[PDB]
Design a protein around this nucleic acid. Structure first.
Ligand SMILES: [Mg+2]
Ligand SMILES: [Mg+2]
Ligand SMILES: [Mg+2]
Ligand SMILES: [Mg+2]
Ligand SMILES: [Mg+2]
Ligand SMILES: [Mg+2]
Ligand SMILES: [Mg+2]
Ligand SMILES: [Mg+2]
Ligand SMILES: [Mg+2]
Ligand SMILES: [Mg+2]
Ligand SMILES: [Mg+2]
Ligand SMILES: [Mg+2]
Ligand SMILES: [Mg+2]
Ligand SMILES: [Mg+2]
Ligand SMILES: [Mg+2]
Ligand SMILES: [Mg+2]
Ligand SMILES: [Mg+2]
Ligand SMILES: [Mg+2]
Ligand SMILES: [Mg+2]
Ligand SMILES: [Mg+2]
Ligand SMILES: [Mg+2]
Ligand SMILES: [Mg+2]
Ligand SMILES: [Mg+2]
Ligand SMILES: [Mg+2]
Ligand SMILES: [Mg+2]
Ligand SMILES: [Mg+2]
Ligand SMILES: [Mg+2]
Ligand SMILES: [Mg+2]
Lengths: 84, 72, 62, 102, 141, 8, 206, 68, 140, 144
RNA sequence: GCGAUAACGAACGAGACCUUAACCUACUAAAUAGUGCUGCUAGCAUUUGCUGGUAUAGUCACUUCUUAGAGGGACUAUCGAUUUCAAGUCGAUGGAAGUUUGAGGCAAUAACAGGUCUGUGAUGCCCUUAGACGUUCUGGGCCGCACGCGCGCUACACUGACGGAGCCAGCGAGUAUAAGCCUUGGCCGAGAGGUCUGGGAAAUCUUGUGAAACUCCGUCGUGCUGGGGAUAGAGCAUUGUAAUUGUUGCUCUUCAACGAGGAAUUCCUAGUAAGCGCAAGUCAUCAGCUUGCGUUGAUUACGUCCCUGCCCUUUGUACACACCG
């Protein structure tokens, strides 16, 4: 076995990197609005056609809520969602 | 319960059969049962012999249905 | 005294459930006295359907 | 141990790389005057697993139907064993696995 | 032109081969034929007590004629039928092994079949000879 | 309610 | 008259057909009369068939059933009551046997009797209901030729089915009794009581 | 029903306003022409676009059409 | 070799491979005569392609078919299609096309399934019911 | 192989093992009226007694009737297999038996107290009139 | 979508898309698929014919049937009717396919105190944490039975039961030093089942899964009968450490309600419904259960808002935690 570590070329186009980056900010106490818009603009800056972020859970309030942050163009149904 | 159809063939019924079956447009297992008051099993053996005796002509041959007619 | 009337025009579905159809009939003999009548079964034009009684028109059904 | 009747068995989940390796080997078996038999399209196997959608047991009884297509091709070559193995390294592909049997 | 087994109806050919095999009398009949049922899925023994073994052997001979190395396990499935499970749905159940194994063994000692290579039971050199003969004496009427 | 009670 | 033989020998009786398509090589269609002007286009006897089993696609469009052979429409309606659905080969046997019984009785053409029994069994006016959400308001309406024909087959087979239930008479000869009586318009037969009772109620609504 | 959608209706009438002289009243000829005129992602949308363009061409010869 | 054409007919799953060769008119079903079809009530379905054109058409050709798959009834329709298509295909290749178009006219005017395979296949079963469209009985 | 007639030889009502048998039933199925004699058992005793099954019950002569009751009472003596018997490997004497009309309920009974006397679970549920073979009773068998 | 138009031009969703089934004698090949010939070879009438076996060296020929990759093919095509002559719809003809070609997969903007912390080494908090609420061992229970309700299976017979005989699918699965897989073929055994070899990690062998309904010929003959097979007695095997509260199978015997079902109510439009079985999942054993698959294969609409549910428009509102107000 041989393991190689390779840098991702377009970090902004990888939702995995963007989700891990968001968690490392939310765990630092940064506000959600400032954290959420940090991935909306980072994804689009890399050249994404569209991006939508949903964060669900509980924050100081006993009741839980979810907030969606869309931008640009997004497709929802059919095979192309599996491709792009 | 009211059927009580005869299953043993005596002599009075035997010649009555040979006197009545020829005067039938169409004979079958039910026709023999319906009007001669004999049982179904007794009708089947009667038909297979009456055909062998030439009185009865076989229109159609089948296990579940025996279509016969007069030979005159 | 039954009378036969060829249908010449299917007006439309009538009745509460739509199970009966308004139709325009024309008599085979004496090609006049055209009447509007209701029919139960499926109907195309040029269907030969006889009438037990002839002297009665039809209007929209409930 | 020289020229032999040699079988190469190709299995993979995706057909594009399978046909590229298959065609590339056939291409190399053409310019090299090596008589060949294949490729033989084996009937594809559909590995199907049908689970319940609900992690719990509440709701309408809805089911997923997952699939895993396995495509298998065998190619017969008439060449010495040294020649066929080096052909495999020429047409090596991560998706397609190769087994060689005499 | 000649006559073969495939040129005669199956149902009345077996009724003719059964008649010959009974009148010939050389077929060895096991002693439990008047007691046993053909299959575990059946509920009654055959109604033709005197002749059912001959007819079944006749059926076995004809069925083996048309194929290649059919085993005795396959014969149980062929003559098996739907079992009458009381309230549970019906199911296919194989026939009795001894009846089929005795028939092919009985047919093996009358000269019509033999154990084929790579399993099964082939038809004998004389097995083709005498079945095609019976076919000719079937269709003259 | 409930409460594990011992005997031995 | 041309008695051909092929190498695969063909029986003599079956070769007597390059002549006419007779149903069950006994029943000719040449001599058959839809004795009603209004049902000629919906009783299909123009295309002869050998056996009432064609396995055609008559349920795709709306009026394809009128193009199905009339005998095949009858044998389709026999296989009912759950345990008989899909048993067409049994249904053809009943029809084949029923025609022979209809032939030995009254000596007519069996399929002529079938056509007569169908035209005589369909009610010409049925009283449909027009109730406005519950109240009784019966209204007399006319009956289309297609529903008139295909309800006759439904009523004829339903009556034959119930007559053969728990009765020594077989279904083929219960169908023969049902068809013969209805063909001649006798009120003793089922599906003639129903047709008169349907047309009787329609008279009580105009 | 067989009601064509907007992705085929508007794309077909752009072809007429752009390539009317090369078009015709034959679907088979039109089908081959649109494979070199437009970049169609799927074959099925190809035979649809050309099938409605043919209908419009068949309609233009009978009088003026709306939208072209 | 000789004048040989090979065709096939199909029903739901049944497929009848027809070997229409030429010869004295030999017509066998899995090595058995058509005079021995098992479903007697359906014996006239395979007799239709014969009596429609006349047995004189089969003097010069012999046909041997091998039918597998499907069911008992589905196999009968596969056989009659292989025979009808085999007779037409032989005429197109070894006889003038005027005769081939003549034979095809009588067959099509009588039954489309003699030459055209039925395209109906079984609908898949969907969950929530015991059949393709049937659903489990609902209770409130 | 043809219809035959008889007079005065038919016997409408038979009495076998103190049980009344209708004489117009076929012999194989007439004996099934005798409790302890099923269809499978009646088929074999008639075949062991050389009484062809094509005969009605009244057709049989006295010579045949005694020959049947002898076989039923001595099945093992007529090449009737042990596994074919009603009560095989008997509890007390260990021999294979076939109990009949009046003997069946006596030894069936004797089995019930033998289960109840040792107070086994199966015997107890038999006493209550409940199902003993593990059947659920929550929702079935609610009649009386 | 046409069209009307203070709107014009668009986006998501729909549709497109993806998978599957139906066509291709037009390409590409196939000894794990099939065929004709050809070697060798059997049976029947001798006419040179008809059925087979054999064939991994006949070091053959071919790809129609079989498999699957690259494509082609349907777009409502042409012609008749109606229509604002528009979107469309209904008929024919050709066609493999003219109901979105049949069937599915995915599926918008928001939402529910819907269901799961009994899927998670996913979780916040509360409780417990050594006489444990952790974990393990033994035994029992989850099956327990006066009762009400729901999903179903057998049936109430003759369009049928048995008894022989004929004899056709498709979707799939399968192991090693294990902890034991699919199991043919042979031999015992009435069966259930037992034993010895061999093949198969699989288009090769199980397997043509020779399935059941079904069909033919017989017995039965309207009878709680040979319909139906509960309940129970005695016995024989299998799995498992262990079968008692019968795991299951087999044999004999017992042979019950049920003679087509009130008020109500469910599912369904073409290879569909209904029968009919088979495989895979659970699984040491047990399928009256689901998920699929195929065999046989219909009646009746192709219409409507009368009931029921939902959507839209108008309307009222003292509701906005939104009538559970
Ligand atoms: Mg989209
Ligand atoms: Mg979609
Ligand atoms: Mg079978
Ligand atoms: Mg059987
Ligand atoms: Mg039953
Ligand atoms: Mg049952
Ligand atoms: Mg969209
Ligand atoms: Mg080989
Ligand atoms: Mg050879
Ligand atoms: Mg679709
Ligand atoms: Mg709640
Ligand atoms: Mg937990
Ligand atoms: Mg937990
Ligand atoms: Mg879990
Ligand atoms: Mg503890
Ligand atoms: Mg429970
Ligand atoms: Mg308990
Ligand atoms: Mg349910
Ligand atoms: Mg009856
Ligand atoms: Mg049977
Ligand atoms: Mg296989
Ligand atoms: Mg009883
Ligand atoms: Mg029982
Ligand atoms: Mg209703
Ligand atoms: Mg409802
Ligand atoms: Mg269990
Ligand atoms: Mg299972
Ligand atoms: Mg408001």
């Amino acid at each position: 076995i041989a393991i190689y570590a390779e840098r991702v070329e377009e970090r902004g186009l990888s939702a995995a990197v963007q989700a891990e980056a968001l968690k490392a900010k939310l765990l630092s106490g940064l506000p959600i609005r400032r954290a959420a818009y940090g991935v909306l603009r980072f994804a689009m800056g890399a050249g994404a056609k569209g991006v939508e972020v949903v964060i669900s859970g509980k924050l100081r309030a006993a009741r839980a809520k979810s907030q969606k942050y869309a931008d640009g163009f997004m497709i929802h149904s059919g095979q192309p969602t599996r491709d792009f | 319960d009211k059927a009580q159809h005869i299953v043993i063939l005596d002599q009075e019924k035997y010649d009555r059969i040979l006197k009545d079956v020829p005067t039938y447009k169409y004979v079958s297992v039910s026709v023999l049962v319906d009007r001669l008051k004999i049982g179904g099993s007794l009708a089947r053996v009667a038909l297979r012999q009456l055909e062998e005796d030439g009185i009865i002509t076989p229109v159609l041959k089948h296990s579940k249905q025996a279509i016969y007619t007069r030979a005159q | 005294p039954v009378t036969l009337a060829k249908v010449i025009k299917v007006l439309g579905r009538t009745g509460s459930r739509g199970g009966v159809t308004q139709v325009r009939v024309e008599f085979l003999e004496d090609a006049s006295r055209t009447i509007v009548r209701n029919v139960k079964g499926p109907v195309r034009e040029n269907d030969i359907l006889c009438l037990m009684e002839s002297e009665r028109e039809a209007r929209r059904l409930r | 141990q020289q020229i032999h009747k040699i079988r190469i068995t190709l299995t993979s989940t995706k057909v594009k790389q399978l046909e590229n390796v298959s065609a590339n080997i056939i291409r190399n078996a053409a310019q090299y005057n090596i008589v060949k038999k294949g490729p033989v399209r084996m009937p594809t196997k559909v590995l199907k697993i049908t689970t319940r959608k609900t992690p719990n047991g509440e709701g309408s009884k809805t089911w997923d139907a997952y699939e895993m297509r396995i495509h298998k091709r065998v190619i017969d070559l008439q060449a010495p064993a040294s020649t066929v193995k080096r052909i495999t390294q020429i047409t090596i592909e991560p998706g397609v696995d190769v087994e060689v049997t005499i | 032109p000649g006559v073969s087994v495939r040129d005669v109806p199956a149902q009345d050919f077996i009724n003719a081969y059964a008649q010959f095999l009974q009148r010939q009398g050389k077929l060895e009949v096991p002693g439990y034929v008047d007691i046993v049922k053909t299959s575990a899925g059946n509920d009654l023994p055959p109604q033709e007590a005197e002749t059912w073994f001959y007819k079944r052997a006749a059926s076995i001979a004809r069925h083996i004629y048309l194929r290649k190395q059919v085993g005795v396990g396959a014969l149980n499935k062929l003559y098996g039928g739907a079992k009458n499970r009381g309230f549970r749905p019906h199911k296919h159940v194989d026939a009795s092994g001894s009846i089929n194994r005795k028939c092919v063994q009985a047919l093996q000692k009358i000269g019509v079949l033999e154990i084929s290579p790579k399993g099964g039971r082939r038809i004998s050199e004389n097995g083709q000879r005498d079945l095609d003969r019976i076919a000719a004496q079937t269709l003259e009427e | 309610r409930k409460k594990k009670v011992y005997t031995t | 008259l041309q008695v051909v033989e092929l190498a695969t020998t063909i029986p003599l009786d079956v070769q007597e057909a390059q002549r006419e398509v007779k149903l069950f090589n006994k029943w000719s269609f040449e001599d058959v009369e839809v004795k009603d002007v209004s049902l000629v286009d919906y009783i299909q006897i123009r295309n002869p068939v050998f056996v009432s089993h064609t396995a055609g696609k008559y349920a795709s469009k709306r009026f394809r059933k009128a193009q199905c052979p009339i005998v095949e429409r009858l044998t389709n309606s026999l296989m009912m009551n759950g345990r008989n659905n899909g048993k067409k080969l049994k249904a053809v046997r009943i029809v084949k046997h029923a025609l022979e019984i209809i032939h030995v009785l009254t000596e007519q053409n069996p399929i002529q009797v079938v056509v007569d029994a169908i035209v005589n069994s369909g009610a010409r006016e049925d009283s449909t209901r027009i109730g406005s959400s519950g109240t009784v308001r019966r209204q007399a309406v006319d009956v289309s030729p297609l529903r008139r024909v295909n309800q006759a087959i439904a009523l004829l087979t339903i009556g034959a089915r119930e007559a053969s239930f728990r009765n020594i008479k077989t279904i083929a000869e219960c169908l023969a009794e049902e068809l013969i009586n209805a063909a001649k318009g006798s009120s003793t037969s089922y599906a003639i009581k129903k047709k008169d009772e349907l047309e009787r109620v329609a008279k009580s609504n105009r | 029903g067989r009601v064509r959608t907007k992705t085929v209706k508007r794309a077909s009438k752009v072809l007429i306003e752009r390539f009317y002289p090369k078009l015709t009243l034959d679907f088979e000829t039109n089908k081959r022409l649109t494979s070199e005129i437009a970049v169609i992602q799927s074959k099925r949308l190809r035979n649809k676009i050309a099938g409605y363009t043919t209908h419009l061409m068949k309609r233009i010869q009978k009088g003026p059409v709306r939208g072209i | 070799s000789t004048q040989s054409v090979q065709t096939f007919g199909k029903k739901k799953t049944a497929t009848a491979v027809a070997h229409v060769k030429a010869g004295k008119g030999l017509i066998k079903i899995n090595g058995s005569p058509i005079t021995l079809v098992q479903p007697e009530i359906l014996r006239f379905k395979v007799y239709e392609p014969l009596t429609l054109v006349g047995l004189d058409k089969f003097q010069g050709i012999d046909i041997r078919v091998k039918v597998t798959g499907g069911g008992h009834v589905s196999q009968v329709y596969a056989i009659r299609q292989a025979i009808a298509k085999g007779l037409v295909a032989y005429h197109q290749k070894y006889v003038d096309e005027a005769s081939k178009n003549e034979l095809k006219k009588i067959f099509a005017s009588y039954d489309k399934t003699l030459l055209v395979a039925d395209s109906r296949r079984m609908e898949p079963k969907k969950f929530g019911g015991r059949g393709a469209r049937a659903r489990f009985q609902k209770s409130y | 192989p043809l219809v035959v007639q008889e007079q005065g030889s038919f016997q409408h009502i038979l009495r076998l093992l103190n049980t009344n048998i209708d004489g117009r039933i076929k012999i194989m199925y007439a004996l099934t009226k005798i409790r302890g004699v099923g269809r499978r058992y009646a088929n074999l005793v008639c075949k062991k007694a050389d009484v062809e099954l094509t005969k009605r019950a009244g057709e049989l002569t006295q010579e045949e009737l005694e020959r049947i009751v002898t076989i039923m009472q001595n099945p093992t003596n007529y090449k009737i297999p042990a596994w074919f018997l009603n009560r095989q490997k008997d509890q007390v004497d260990g021999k294979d038996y076939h109990v009949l009309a009046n003997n069946l309920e006596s030894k069936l009974r004797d089995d019930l107290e033998r289960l109840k006397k040792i107070r086994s679970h199966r015997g107890i549920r038999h006493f209550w009139g409940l199902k003993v073979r593990g059947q659920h009773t929550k929702t079935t068998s609610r009649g009386r």
